[PDB]
Amino acid sequence: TSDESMIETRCVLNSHSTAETTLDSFFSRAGLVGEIDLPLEG
């Protein structure tokens, strides 16, 4: 509850960016989605 109704708080300047929790940050990372085998004798 925004830390105010539970404890006494000081002023904190939250220069904490939320840009890394976006979908374009959480999902724009290449991951293995397919492996194709082209063997010689298999």
Add this chain to the structure above:
Amino acid sequence: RVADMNTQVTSDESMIETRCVLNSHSTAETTLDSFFSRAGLVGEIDLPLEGTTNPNGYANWDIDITGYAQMRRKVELFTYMRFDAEFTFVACTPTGQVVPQLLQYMFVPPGAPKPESRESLAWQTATNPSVFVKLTDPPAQVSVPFMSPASAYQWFYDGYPTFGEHKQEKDLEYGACPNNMMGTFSVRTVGSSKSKYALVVRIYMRMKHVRAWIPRPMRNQNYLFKANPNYAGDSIKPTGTSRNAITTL
């Protein structure tokens, strides 16, 4: 209700008589962005064919740049040190040969699963930053940001990470600030079967946008262990060369 709540005609002047000297001498090469933005060897990864070091074609190199004396002494001139890093990986045969082998560098941040094998499912790198590159390609260069939870990296941590009583079994935790260990750098040969080439991955790291804070004395003793200021006590050498007498050179 309480009210209590450039030489001109010790700056060379007080010691000798001086002429006017126009000092067009730039200080731009002594900056941190000049002294530290030079890539140095911070890691070497061995992927041999018959050796017992990394025989399965994969290796998990814990990110610790204090493994080589040159760059370790360079960065250990300070304690607190915030920078972005240009990481370069020069993969080659132990004979120096450039073999047609495909490798997968993978940055494994703390908490991410370290691969237990060459064909591990952690190599799918759906969220981990990973590099796919051949040895015939030029060395893989990546820009690594300042990733520490702290405001700067900390080559000297006078303290312990955890609480509780610190016995001799937990004495290895001294100086190990987890603001500096940033997971492992995982290398594999991308394939089900064992690679036919012995491989050496040399990590060269160049720090950009460097900020460093607290200068300490340099390292005048031989480094022995990574992230450890331990020195050979029975072979302490002086900071420099010696003289047969003080009245002579």
Add this chain to the structure above:
Amino acid sequence: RVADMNTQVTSDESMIETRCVLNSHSTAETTLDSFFSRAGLVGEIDLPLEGTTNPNGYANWDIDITGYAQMRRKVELFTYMRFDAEFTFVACTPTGQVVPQLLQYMFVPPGAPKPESRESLAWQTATNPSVFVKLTDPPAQVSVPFMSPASAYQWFYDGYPTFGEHKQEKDLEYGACPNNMMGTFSVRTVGSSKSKYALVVRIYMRMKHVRAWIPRPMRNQNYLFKANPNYAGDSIKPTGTSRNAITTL
């Protein structure tokens, strides 16, 4: 950079129907300056001829107004109580006779020497406030200020005066606030030889400019010891009279 540093037409109205009543009823007699500015017996001093109480013609009465139940219960309605006192001393024979005897009342504040005899050198009263008066004279009346180091007198002191561990031998110090003990009230017969009259000095004390703060429950038990809320545990009586049954009167 932080920003954190008189009845008219429950006031008789919600229960019954009321008429308008002009309440010209003064509240001036229920004030502290009305309830407490009445002199009461706070001390009796015996100076007999053959008794062992004060046989030498002098007495040192420690100032403690909790010696008589009426005024003690009056003032003990509160804890904190700041006032100036009108002290009256009615000296007489134990038979009530008014004898031609000269007495010396002497206020001995804490630190001042208590007289060890009738002819003590403390009776020179060069700094101590002292009263010289005959028994044939009217009772000696003096205005005593508010002399406490505290902001009010304190008939109940929930604590100890000194520090350190409080054993059973030091248990008598409980409730003894030295903001209230104001030395002794010393009486003598002014003379080298023993007075020929048995004497009784009755201290009557009237408090003026009274300020009292914290009302407590009154005293519903019999007082036993001065400056002590001790009660007879095996003979605890109720606050009032009893009834044979609750459905009857």
